[PDB]
Design an enzyme around this catalytic site. Structure first.
Site, PDB file in Angstrom:
ATOM      1  N   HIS A  40       0.974  -1.102  -0.172  1.00 13.26           N
ATOM      2  CA  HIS A  40       0.016  -0.081  -0.265  1.00 13.26           C
ATOM      3  C   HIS A  40       0.860   1.112  -0.601  1.00 13.26           C
ATOM      4  O   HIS A  40       0.111   2.100   0.103  1.00 13.26           O
ATOM      5  CB  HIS A  40      -1.573   0.022   1.136  1.00 13.26           C
ATOM      6  CG  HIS A  40      -0.460   0.805   2.716  1.00 13.26           C
ATOM      7  ND1 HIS A  40      -0.385  -0.560   3.284  1.00 13.26           N
ATOM      8  CD2 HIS A  40      -0.379   1.909   2.166  1.00 13.26           C
ATOM      9  CE1 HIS A  40       0.243   0.484   4.597  1.00 13.26           C
ATOM     10  NE2 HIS A  40       0.369   1.253   3.983  1.00 13.26           N
ATOM     11  N   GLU A  52      19.712   6.728   8.307  1.00 14.52           N
ATOM     12  CA  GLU A  52      18.215   8.370   9.166  1.00 14.52           C
ATOM     13  C   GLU A  52      18.511   7.693  10.156  1.00 14.52           C
ATOM     14  O   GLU A  52      17.819   6.956  11.509  1.00 14.52           O
ATOM     15  CB  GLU A  52      16.947   8.045   8.251  1.00 14.52           C
ATOM     16  CG  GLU A  52      17.231   8.755   7.340  1.00 14.52           C
ATOM     17  CD  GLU A  52      18.120  10.631   6.525  1.00 14.52           C
ATOM     18  OE1 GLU A  52      18.862  11.096   7.962  1.00 14.52           O
ATOM     19  OE2 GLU A  52      17.744  10.988   6.302  1.00 14.52           O
ATOM     20  N   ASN A  54      17.458  11.470  12.481  1.00 10.74           N
ATOM     21  CA  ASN A  54      16.950  13.112  12.079  1.00 10.74           C
ATOM     22  C   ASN A  54      16.546  12.942  10.774  1.00 10.74           C
ATOM     23  O   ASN A  54      17.492  13.333  10.067  1.00 10.74           O
ATOM     24  CB  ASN A  54      17.532  14.044  12.225  1.00 10.74           C
ATOM     25  CG  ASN A  54      16.595  15.804  12.398  1.00 10.74           C
ATOM     26  OD1 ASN A  54      15.752  15.536  11.190  1.00 10.74           O
ATOM     27  ND2 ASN A  54      17.034  16.307  13.712  1.00 10.74           N
ATOM     28  N   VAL A  57      17.014  16.202   8.782  1.00  9.85           N
ATOM     29  CA  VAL A  57      19.146  17.544   9.037  1.00  9.85           C
ATOM     30  C   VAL A  57      19.786  15.471   8.368  1.00  9.85           C
ATOM     31  O   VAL A  57      20.081  15.314   9.168  1.00  9.85           O
ATOM     32  CB  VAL A  57      19.017  17.137  10.259  1.00  9.85           C
ATOM     33  CG1 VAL A  57      20.612  18.047  10.693  1.00  9.85           C
ATOM     34  CG2 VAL A  57      18.284  18.800  10.968  1.00  9.85           C
ATOM     35  N   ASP A  84       0.397  -7.398   1.772  1.00  5.91           N
ATOM     36  CA  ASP A  84       0.064  -6.363   1.732  1.00  5.91           C
ATOM     37  C   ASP A  84       2.125  -6.110   2.154  1.00  5.91           C
ATOM     38  O   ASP A  84       2.157  -6.087   3.147  1.00  5.91           O
ATOM     39  CB  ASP A  84      -0.616  -4.863   2.736  1.00  5.91           C
ATOM     40  CG  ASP A  84       0.382  -3.704   2.896  1.00  5.91           C
ATOM     41  OD1 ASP A  84       0.570  -3.082   1.926  1.00  5.91           O
ATOM     42  OD2 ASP A  84       0.281  -3.315   3.466  1.00  5.91           O
ATOM     43  N   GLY A 175       2.692   6.652   8.334  1.00 10.23           N
ATOM     44  CA  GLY A 175       3.743   6.841   7.846  1.00 10.23           C
ATOM     45  C   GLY A 175       4.511   5.866   8.680  1.00 10.23           C
ATOM     46  O   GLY A 175       6.030   5.621   8.160  1.00 10.23           O
ATOM     47  N   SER A 177       3.326   2.983   7.886  1.00 10.89           N
ATOM     48  CA  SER A 177       2.948   1.782   7.185  1.00 10.89           C
ATOM     49  C   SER A 177       4.798   1.686   6.893  1.00 10.89           C
ATOM     50  O   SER A 177       5.476   2.494   5.928  1.00 10.89           O
ATOM     51  CB  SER A 177       2.798   2.822   5.865  1.00 10.89           C
ATOM     52  OG  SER A 177       1.600   3.191   6.884  1.00 10.89           O
ATOM     53  N   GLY A 178       4.955   0.190   6.416  1.00 11.76           N
ATOM     54  CA  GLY A 178       5.702  -0.337   5.184  1.00 11.76           C
ATOM     55  C   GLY A 178       6.783  -1.139   6.241  1.00 11.76           C
ATOM     56  O   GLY A 178       7.446  -1.419   5.714  1.00 11.76           O
TER      57      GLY A 178
HETATM   58  N1  LIG Z   1      -2.610   1.241  13.515  1.00 10.65           N
HETATM   59  C1  LIG Z   1      -2.408   1.232  12.433  1.00 10.65           C
HETATM   60  N2  LIG Z   1      -3.443   2.421  11.744  1.00 10.65           N
HETATM   61  N3  LIG Z   1      -1.174   1.395  11.863  1.00 10.65           N
HETATM   62  C2  LIG Z   1      -1.058   0.687  10.577  1.00 10.65           C
HETATM   63  C3  LIG Z   1      -1.056   2.336   9.981  1.00 10.65           C
HETATM   64  C4  LIG Z   1      -1.885   2.498   8.131  1.00 10.65           C
HETATM   65  O1  LIG Z   1      -0.304   1.662   7.565  1.00 10.65           O
HETATM   66 CA   LIG Z   2      19.481  12.719   8.614  1.00 10.00          CA
END
Ligand SMILES: NC(=[NH2+])NCCCO
Ligand SMILES: [Ca+2]
Length: 223
Positions: A40, A52, A54, A57, A84, A175, A177-178
């Protein structure tokens, strides 16, 4: 991540940020040339940001590497969110060191009650929005396959696990996600779906990575 804490810098060396002008999803480095994430999260153009802490930055440990190939699971269903999962091939190999490292795929599925680490740059508020600069972390257990199924009647397939807290306040969010769910040194979950985030009796649902090791290895070997 709602209800988490700031990870120590670079303490989650397999965590990546997927960027397309800004951070939009997490992923996990599983080979020097491959990241696994959620289908998704698909975009046709992705820059993978490794090393990463931060995201706002340049701190000196980052490696920014464009995606060369982006392969969603052929049986991803955008309605049910079954399968997914997505693989991203890097245009050059990540350089592995203490701050950029692979995470093992599962040797087995994880028992209910196994403690896991969930991480990402997703929303940190249970109400409103705050998107962090610094990587967030959350310790959470794999939930009873029943406590998962009662929370989402008819919606949990054999390719999904719940990890989290039925009382609310501690969850992954938009965010994240994945991104990774790592339990006993193994990538067991990918942040997939839920009903909002950190709500009571609506734990996060995660792609069950221990069902996908053959797909992952076969895709890697073919591409
Ligand atoms: N609990 C959640 N809704 N986590 C998944 C966020 C959507 O990928
Ligand atoms: Ca950084």
């Amino acid at each position: 991540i709602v209800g988490g804490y700031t990870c120590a810098a670079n303490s989650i060396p397999y965590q990546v940020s997927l960027n397309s002008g800004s951070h939009f999803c997490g992923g996990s480095l599983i080979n020097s040339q491959w990241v696994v994430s959620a289908a998704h999260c698909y975009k046709s153009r992705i820059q993978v940001r490794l090393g990463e802490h931060n995201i706002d930055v340049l701190e000196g440990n980052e490696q920014f590497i464009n995606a060369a190939k982006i392969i969603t699971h052929p049986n991803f269903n955008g309605n049910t969110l079954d399968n997914d999962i997505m693989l991203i091939k890097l245009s050059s190999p990540a350089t592995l060191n203490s701050r950029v490292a692979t995470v093992s795929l599962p040797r087995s599925c994880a028992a209910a009650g196994t403690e896991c680490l969930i991480s990402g740059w997703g929303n940190t508020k249970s109400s409103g929005s705050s998107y962090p600069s610094l990587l967030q972390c959350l310790k959470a257990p794999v939930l009873s396959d029943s406590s998962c199924k009662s929370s989402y009647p008819g919606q949990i397939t054999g390719n999904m696990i719940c990890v989290g807290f039925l009382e609310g306040g501690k969850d992954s969010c938009q965010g994240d996600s994945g991104g990774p769910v790592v339990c006993n040194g193994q990538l067991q979950g990918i942040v997939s779906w839920g009903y909002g985030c950190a709500q009571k009796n609506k734990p996060g649902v995660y792609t069950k990575v221990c069902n996908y090791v053959n797909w992952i290895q076969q895709t890697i070997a073919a591409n």
